[PDB]
Each structure stands twice: as C-alpha cells, then as structure tokens.
Curated annotation (Swiss-Prot):
Site keyed Transition state stabilizer: positions: H94, D97
Protein name: 5'-nucleotidase
Recorded family membership: Belongs to the 5'-nucleotidase family.
Top EC class for this record: hydrolase
Lipid attachment residues per UniProt (GPI-anchor amidated serine): S525
Annotated disease: Calcification of joints and arteries: A condition characterized by adult-onset calcification of the lower extremity arteries, including the iliac, femoral and tibial arteries, and hand and foot capsule joints. Age of onset has been reported as early as the second decade of life, usually involving intense joint pain or calcification in the hands.
C-alpha cells in the first residue's frame, strides 16, 4: 500500500502578520501586496479540503520583525498560529529575544500546538519551570497513521539572542539521533525533522541522522524551487532538495524563504513501513490572486487598532528607495546602511557638552542588523512603523575607541566567508574600504582610508595600524557580536549611547527629506 502526506510549512515569518509589499516592507499598494496570516489561512484551507492527510509546520523565527512584536510581544504569534491550526512549531533563535520569560508566558503557555527543540537542554532551576512547555519531539496522529516530528534549534542562538545561561544548545546531530532512535522503538516509522539551523545544517542532518525521512528547515532564508520561480527570489536549489543519506536513502530537504511570502508545500508518498517512495512540490506564492480570509483579516484589523499609534506621525520623507534588503546590505554597499551610519554620526554630534566624542566621524554597522527596506512611492512617507521594521532589535549606537590594527582585523572579519549572505558584512561611514576577494581570508582588505580626527579639514587618509580611532557602532558589535571578538577584547574605551531607532528618527525629522546614495564607500577589485 501507499500513504500520502502533504507537509505545509513556513519559516522566518518575522512578525509579518499583515500582508506586505513584494520586498517585505509595509503594504501600501494593496493590489500588489503579498503574504500575511489572513491570506495564508485561505491557502491552507484550500489544501486541507483537497488533501486528507495534512500537517502545517513552522520552523522558527515567528518572533521579531515589526511593531506587531513590539506591542504584542509574542501573544499575536500564539493567537494567529492557533487560528491557523498549526500542528507544530520548532523554536527559533528569535524566540529567545525577549528572554526565556518572554518565550514561556506569551507563546509556550498560550500555544495550542506542540513547540519543539531536542538539542535545547534546560538546566538548574529553569528545568522544572519549563518542563513540558517545549518537547524534543511530538508524535502526531494523522488519519490512521502517526508522524513523529523532532525539533532542533541553531547552536549559534546564545550569540544571536538572549536564551540565558540555564539553556544549553547541544549539537543537533548528536541531540537528534537518540530521539529519532527512541521513536523507532516506539513503532514510529515516519519521521520529520523540523528545525531552525540553516540549509547547510539541514542537509547534514538529512545525511547523518539515521531514520529521518524529511527535513523542514528555516533560519538561512533559503528559497528552493523546481521550475521558473514566480517572483524576485533566486532559487538556491530544487524543491525538495534531495540529500542522499549515509544509510542509502533519498531524503527531501525543504525551506520556504521568509516573511510569509510563500507557503511551503510538499506531497510525500510513503509505503506501509514509512519509507519515502517519492516527494514533489513547490512553495506557493501568497499573492493578490489568493484572497485574504475575511474572518482572520477582521481579527487582524481588531488587533491592528492598537498599532496605528506608531503609523500616524510622519517623521519625514524619502525621495529614493531605501535599500535595506539582505541581498544588498550583506553583499555590498547599501544606501540604507549609509543613512543609518550618517544618522549615528550626526546625532552623536548634537551632544556637544560631551568632549570626548564630539568629532567622531567614523561608523561601522553590521549589515545583518538592517532588517527591512522602505519604499519611496507613496510620496515616500516614513513613519515609526516603517523604522521599526528596519531596526527591530531595540539596541543602542555605542561609542568605542579602537586601535587601527583592531579595525583592519574587523574589516577582514567582515568578508572572511563572503557569499553566504551572512550578517557580519559592514556598512560604513567616514570609512572608504576596498576589498580584493581573489585573496585569502585575513588578507582581503587592499585599501582602508578613514577620516582624520587630528586635522583641521577632514580628508580620507590611510588607516595606520598603531594609531587610535574613535568609531560609532551598534552595542551588539561593541559587545563582540557577529564573531567580532577583536572588538570586545581590543577596544580601549566603550561608552553606551542613544537608542538606535531614536537616532534614525531624530535624523530623519531633522533632514525632512532624505536621499542617501551609494557613493563608493565599499568597493571591490
Ligand atoms: O535573524 P536570523 O535570520 O535568525 C540570523 O541572522 C543573524 C544576523 O543578524 C544580525 N544580528 N543578529 C543578532 C543581532 C543583534 N542582537 C541580538 C540580541 C542580543 C541580545 C539580546 C537580544 C537580541 Cl535579539 N543586534 C544586531 Cl544590531 N544585529 C544582530 C547579525 O548580523 C547576524 O549575522
Ligand atoms: C500570482 O502568482 C501566480 C503564480 O506564480 C502568477 O501566475 C500570477 O500572475 C500572480 N498574480 C498576481 C501578481 O496578481
Ligand atoms: Ca521512515
Ligand atoms: Zn529569521
Ligand atoms: Zn534564525
């Protein structure tokens, strides 16, 4: 006999509860808007009504991304994931943004579906407090069968969030294998690994973890597609991505990009012993052709009311596209990057009573901290909401005194694994950097000119290794985030500065009309 399972899946929704523009920014032209829970619901229901055996799965990073999360703090996530009748979720690295308390009380206690992570181990007083609220696996009934779903979360989570020192993030493969074996001994022949580690780790899992039939991932924002893709996202491989396992089997790996723009859709065809005979599908583009469900939309609008406080007051206006996309800001100079740094610099110079930092002209900004673009087409209005999506962490723009040799080392770190859309890539201000990627990591920086401080007229002179420089940057980087160990360890002074979003709102309010360009601050050769 045969048994067909349809896996529906989302990942990295990032609090895009409402429908959004093509590029994930705030929705304005509703006729061309995409995604959102209301639209998703409609599509999920069409599938549920057509297919008898269906599972709806999330692979983490529902938390953090828009004012939805700033205001409702995870309660919106639980509430609307419950309304969509999610079958399971894997804990993501952003689910630990508001601490463990901020995971437990809004989400884990209010979610009506199992929330999973096998490689997160609770220790000390936390263990008994959190016992049962998340699980390593869940065995779900699906018709006359059962499907084991085993959870995992990125080992990078303690460096990217706030899980605390009571949670230990074990290696995924080590953590998973006993759980998958345990399931086998419980006569569970169909096993899905749902987790939040990235496409590369998902592939390793499929290869290395005996017993796993399917891997449904997230974290890396990977778009997979079989055929001609329906939008601007460039596929990284076929959907499903077939990994050939060490134990001689074809294991489908899947992911569904990000921002609720696509619903992932995989039909698995199983035998009576839970082996994958075949699988096919593609991620479904959630566009205007799919109507928003009326009930969910009405419910969204009810919850929306509280949020409209953050959209009312126009801070200012842009007359250019503010390119805060991952694809620009992690790979090259992006004008949103330049806007944010110029604001960091400018706002700091307002504090004239402070003697030490009032000629600071140099800025570095982790591109991965830039989380949304802003559109210029509705008279390019900029509200607080628009700004919250760009900078959703709520950190500070701190001030550091760094040696020249430290900065060279940071800019070397900035491109040490270039090509993988990682967040360490540095947007800059008062700095003209030139990379040669043909060279090896640790020696990719061929030119690094910075603005002189001890000079009457500021010009760009070469960074000297033994000179000392004053730089403005996010506290995340100052605290040694994004693997910038050299900053934390080699900084000479570190002063806590102003709140990130306030700095950029204050700047925009001051300027009225903004038009940041790409000027050749970061060049390649
Ligand atoms: O998003 P994901 O697809 O799950 C993985 O993205 C990874 C990238 O995001 C950036 N990042 N990560 C974290 C991060 C932070 N504070 C994290 C943080 C620290 C303490 C408390 C709460 C939080 Cl929330 N602050 C900035 Cl200003 N930037 C950041 C990096 O650039 C990295 O490479
Ligand atoms: C929605 O996506 C489908 C499938 O890619 C496409 O054929 C259709 O034109 C799209 N409709 C829009 C953008 O209105
Ligand atoms: Ca099996
Ligand atoms: Zn994410
Ligand atoms: Zn993530």
């Amino acid at each position: 006999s045969m048994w067909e399972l349809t896996i529906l899946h989302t990942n990295d929704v990032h609090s895009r509860l409402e429908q959004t523009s093509e590029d994930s920014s705030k929705c304005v032209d509703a006729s061309r808007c995409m995604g959102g829970v209301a639209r998703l619901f409609t599509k999920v229901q069409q599938i549920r009504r057509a297919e008898p055996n269906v599972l709806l799965l999330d692979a983490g990073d529902q938390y953090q991304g828009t004012i939805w999360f700033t205001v409702y703090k995870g309660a919106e996530v639980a509430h609307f994931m419950n309304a969509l009748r999610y079958d399971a979720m894997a804990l993501g690295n952003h689910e630990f943004d508001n601490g463990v308390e901020g995971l437990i009380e809004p989400l884990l206690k209010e979610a009506k579906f199992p929330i999973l992570s096998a490689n997160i181990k609770a220790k000390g007083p936390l263990a008994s407090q959190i016992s049962g609220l998340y699980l390593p696996y869940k065995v779900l009934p699906v018709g006359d069968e059962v499907v084991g779903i085993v959870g995992y979360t990125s080992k990078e989570t303690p460096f990217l969030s706030n899980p605390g020192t009571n949670l230990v993030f074990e290696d995924e493969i080590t953590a998973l294998q006993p759980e998958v074996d345990k399931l086998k001994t419980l006569n569970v022949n169909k096993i899905i690994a749902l987790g939040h580690s990235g496409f590369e780790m998902d592939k390793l899992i499929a290869q290395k973890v005996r017993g796993v039939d399917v891997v449904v991932g997230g974290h890396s924002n990977t778009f997979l597609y079989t055929g001609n893709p329906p939008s601007k996202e460039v596929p990284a491989g076929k959907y499903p991505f077939i990994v050939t396992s060490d134990d001689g089997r074809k294991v489908p790996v899947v992911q569904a990009y990000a921002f609720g723009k696509y619903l992932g859709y995989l039909k698995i065809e199983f035998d009576e012993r839970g082996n994958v005979i075949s699988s096919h599908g593609n991620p479904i583009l959630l566009n205007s052709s799919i109507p928003e469900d009326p009930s969910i939309k009405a419910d969204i609008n009810k919850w929306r009311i509280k949020l409209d406080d953050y959209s009312t007051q126009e801070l200012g206006k842009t007359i250019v596209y503010l390119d805060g996309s991952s694809q620009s800001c992690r790979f090259r100079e992006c004008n949103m990057g330049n806007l944010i740094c110029d604001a960091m610099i400018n706002n700091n110079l307002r504090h004239t009573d402070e003697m030490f930092w009032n000629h600071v002209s140099m800025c570095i900004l982790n591109g991965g901290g830039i989380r949304s673009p802003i559109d210029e087409r509705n008279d390019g209005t900029i509200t607080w909401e628009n700004l919250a999506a760009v900078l959703p962490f709520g950190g500070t723009f701190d001030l550091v005194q760094l040696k020249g040799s430290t900065l060279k080392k940071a800019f070397e770190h900035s491109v040490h694994r270039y090509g993988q859309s990682t967040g360490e890539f540095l947007q800059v201000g008062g700095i003209h950097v030139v990379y040669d990627l043909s060279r090896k990591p640790g020696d990719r920086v061929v030119k690094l000119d910075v603005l002189c401080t001890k000079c009457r007229v500021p010009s760009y002179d070469p960074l000297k290794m033994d000179e000392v420089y004053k730089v403005i940057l996010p506290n995340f980087l100052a605290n040694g985030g994004d693997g910038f160990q050299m900053i934390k360890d080699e900084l000479l002074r570190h002063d806590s500065g102003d709140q990130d979003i306030n700095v950029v709102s204050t700047y925009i309010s001051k300027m009225k009309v903004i038009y940041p360009a790409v000027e050749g601050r970061i060049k390649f050769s």
